[PDB]
Design a protein around this ligand. Structure first.
Ligand SMILES: CCCC[C@H](NC(=O)[C@H](Cc1ccccc1)NC(=O)N1CCOCC1)C(=O)N[C@@H](CC1CCCCC1)C(O)(O)C(F)(F)C(=O)NC
Length: 330
């Protein structure tokens, strides 16, 4: 079996991608952020504290015939940006893109932080990292993908993010029309439960490639590219008024710059992020100072290939028994 769903940026900087998902019987449609660095499917719900919901679409398990409370399960997550949510758990049927999974744990928020409340177009998350990270206690629950994987023609999904434009997640199959040339696949480490891989090095603009291993995670739920403070200095040194800013917390640059591209290595292959994908945009409505898309990881403590990097590529998460990550140009 297969499924094919359209994800669409939430805003005109592609800060994040929402993808329609059907939960329950009959279907409730919520739009979920597809998250490869987390392993919880959680949703806005009927049980969500009322003062914390603001225009989001809520799951009402009371209305679904397939919904069962999972008695005493609780869950509680917190993420890189300090956002958090917790609450209780049903199981229910979930479809993505035609692909149906029965008995999926759907974690129902009771309490979300302010950051969630603020973001009206995201009605919760669909984790796609490794099931080890799921936070439901006391019985850890499986991911959407792990539940599908039985049924799948092929235990891969693929991510094909767009630059200011809709893009597609596919389960079960590789669209050989979606990419040019060949996919290079590269080993994953599951140890910390991330799709963990190692980049082969980098180029700035039309500079020389440096060979150098950068360990990072492929993370569709993280907006920017976060690189070691060395790699990142190299890049912004090539941008005329660019500097590191304490008030902004970041690398800023005059909006009037052109950015050079960034190449990252995948085995012997090279992926090139066009300069314009790096252009985040104005830091504050009407400032002549723009925020960059390439940011240092020193403070976070892993390297993240976020959406800037992965929208440059057609990406396969091959969830075989030995997982791999495949990258191709498109
Ligand atoms: C500092 C490094 C991590 C930050 C990363 N978040 C991000 O990258 C959020 C994504 C977002 C877009 C729109 C609205 C709200 C959030 N964006 C963000 O912080 N910025 C600030 C810089 O401008 C660009 C957008 C993150 O926490 N990713 C989570 C999942 C998200 C959490 C917040 C809601 C959206 C999804 C993650 O699961 O992928 C994780 F790996 F980082 C994680 O915490 N695993 C436990």
């Amino acid at each position: 079996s297969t499924g094919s769903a359209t994800t669409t940026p939430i805003d005109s900087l592609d800060d994040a991608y929402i993808t329609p998902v059907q939960i329950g019987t009959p279907a409730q449609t919520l739009n979920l952020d597809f998250d490869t660095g987390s392993s919880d499917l959680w949703v806005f719900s009927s049980e969500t504290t009322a003062s914390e919901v603001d225009g989001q679409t809520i799951y009402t398990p009371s209305k679904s015939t397939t919904a069962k409370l999972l008695s005493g399960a609780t869950w509680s997550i917190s993420y890189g940006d300090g956002s958090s949510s917790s609450g209780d758990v049903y199981t229910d049927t979930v479809s993505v893109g035609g692909l149906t999974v029965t008995g999926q744990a759907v974690e129902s928020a009771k309490k979300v932080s302010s950051s969630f409340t603020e973001d009206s177009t995201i009605d919760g998350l669909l984790g796609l990292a490794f099931s080890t990270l799921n936070t439901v206690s006391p019985t850890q629950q499986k991911t959407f993908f792990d539940n599908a994987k039985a049924s799948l023609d092929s235990p891969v999904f693929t991510a094909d993010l767009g630059y200011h434009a809709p893009g597609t997640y596919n389960f079960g199959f590789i669209d050989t029309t979606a990419y040019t040339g060949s996919i290079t696949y590269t080993a994953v480490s599951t140890k910390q439960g991330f799709w963990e891989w190692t980049s082969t090095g980098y180029a700035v603009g039309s500079g020389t490639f440096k060979s150098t291993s950068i360990d990072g995670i492929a993370d569709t739920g993280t907006t920017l590219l976060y690189l070691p403070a060395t790699v990142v200095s190299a890049y912004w040194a090539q941008v005329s008024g660019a500097k590191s800013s304490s008030s902004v917390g970041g690398y800023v640059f005059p909006c009037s710059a052109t950015l050079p591209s960034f190449t990252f290595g995948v085995g012997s292959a090279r992926i090139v992020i066009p300069g314009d994908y790096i252009d985040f945009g104005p830091i504050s409505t009407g400032s002549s100072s723009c925020f960059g898309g390439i940011q240092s990881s020193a403070g976070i403590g892993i390297n993240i290939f976020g959406d800037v990097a992965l929208k440059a590529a057609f990406v396969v998460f091959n969830g075989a028994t030995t997982p791999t990550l495949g990258f191709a140009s498109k």
